[PDB]
Amino acid sequence: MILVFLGPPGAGKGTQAKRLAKEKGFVHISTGDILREAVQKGTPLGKKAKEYMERGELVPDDLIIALIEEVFPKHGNVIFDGFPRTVKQAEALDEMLEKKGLKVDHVLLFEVPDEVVIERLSGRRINPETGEVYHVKYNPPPPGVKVIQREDDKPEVIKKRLEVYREQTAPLIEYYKKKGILRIIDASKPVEEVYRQVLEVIG
Numbered sequence: 645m646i647l648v649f650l651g652p653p654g655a656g657k658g659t660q661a662k663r664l665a666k667e668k669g670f671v672h673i674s675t676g677d678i679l680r681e682a683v684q685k686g687t688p689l690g691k692k693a694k695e696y697m698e699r700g701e702l703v704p705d706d707l708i709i710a711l712i713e714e715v716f717p718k719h720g721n722v723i724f725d726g727f728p729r730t731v732k733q734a735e736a737l738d739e740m741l742e743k744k745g746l747k748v749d750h751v752l753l754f755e756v757p758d759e760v761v762i763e764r765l766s767g768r769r770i771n772p773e774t775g776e777v778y779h780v781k782y783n784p785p786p787p788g789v790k791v792i793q794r795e796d797d798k799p800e801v802i803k804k805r806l807e808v809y810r811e812q813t814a815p816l817i818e819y820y821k822k823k824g825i826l827r828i829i830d831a832s833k834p835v836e837e838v839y840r841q842v843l844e845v846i847g
C-alpha cells in the first residue's frame with residue numbers, strides 16, 4: 645500500500661507516519677527529514693537546499709524528484725510524507741510508481757486551521773541526537789533531554805511556509821480528488837484521535 649500524507653506544515657504528518665510505520669509496517673519517506681540530513685552533512689544537495697528551507701520556500705522540484713528516486717523502495721508499504729508538494733512533483737511520483745509497477749492507493753489530507761498549526765510549529769522541538777520530535781505543550785521532552793528549535797520553525801518562516809502551502813501545494817487537493825483517491829483526516833484532534841482516523845481510512 646502506497647500512502648501520501650498531504651497537508652500544511654505542523655499538521656502532524658510526521659508524527660502519524662512514524663507511528664503507522666512502526667505499528668502497521670510501512671517505510672516512511674520524509675522529504676523534510678532527508679533534506680535536513682543533507683544540510684547537516686553538507687552535501688551538494690544540502691548546500692543548495694539550505695537557502696530555500698531556512699526561508700520557508702520550497703526546494704526546487706528537480707532536486708526533490710532526485711531525492712525521492714534515491715530513496716524509493718522496490719515495492720510494498722510506503723508513506724510519502726511531505727511529498728509531493730507541487731503538481732510537477734505529483735506527476736513525477738506517478739511516473740516513478742508506474743516504472744516500479746505501483747500506484748498511489750490513498751492520499752490522506754490532514755485538514756487543520758492555520759492557528760492550530762502555528763502553535764504546533766512554534767512549540768515544536770527536536771532532540772538533535774535521536775531526532776525525536778517533541779512539543780513544549782503537547783509532548784514535552786523529559787527531564788535531561790536537550791532539544792532545539794528548527795530554524796524554519798521561527799514565526800516569519802512559519803508564515804511563509806503556510807503561504808507557500810496555500811499557493812503551490814493546496815492545488816494537489818483537487819489533483820487527487822479528480823483521481824478519486826483523496827481522503828480527508830481531521831488533523832486538529834489529539835494524536836490518538838488522528839491516528840484512529842488514519843487507520844479507519846486505510847483499514
Ligand SMILES: Nc1ncnc2c1ncn2[C@@H]1O[C@H](COP(=O)(O)OP(=O)(O)O)[C@@H](O)[C@H]1O
Nearest residue numbers: 653675676696697700701702703708726727729
Ligand atoms: N516535497 C518538497 N518539495 C520542496 N521542498 C520541500 C519538500 N519537502 C520538504 N521541503 C523543504 O523542507 C522544508 C521542511 O520540510 P517539511 O515537509 O515542511 O518538513 P516539516 O513539516 O517536518 O518541517 C520545507 O519548507 C521545504 O523548504
Ligand SMILES: Nc1ncnc2c1ncn2[C@@H]1O[C@H](COP(=O)(O)OP(=O)(O)O)[C@@H](O)[C@H]1O
Nearest residue numbers: 654655656657658659764768778779782834835
Ligand atoms: N494531534 C496533535 N496535537 C497536538 N500536537 C501535535 C499533534 N500532532 C503532532 N503534534 C506536535 O506538533 C508539531 C508538528 O508535528 P509534526 O508531526 O512534526 O507535523 P508535520 O510533519 O505535519 O510538520 C510537533 O511538535 C508535534 O509534537
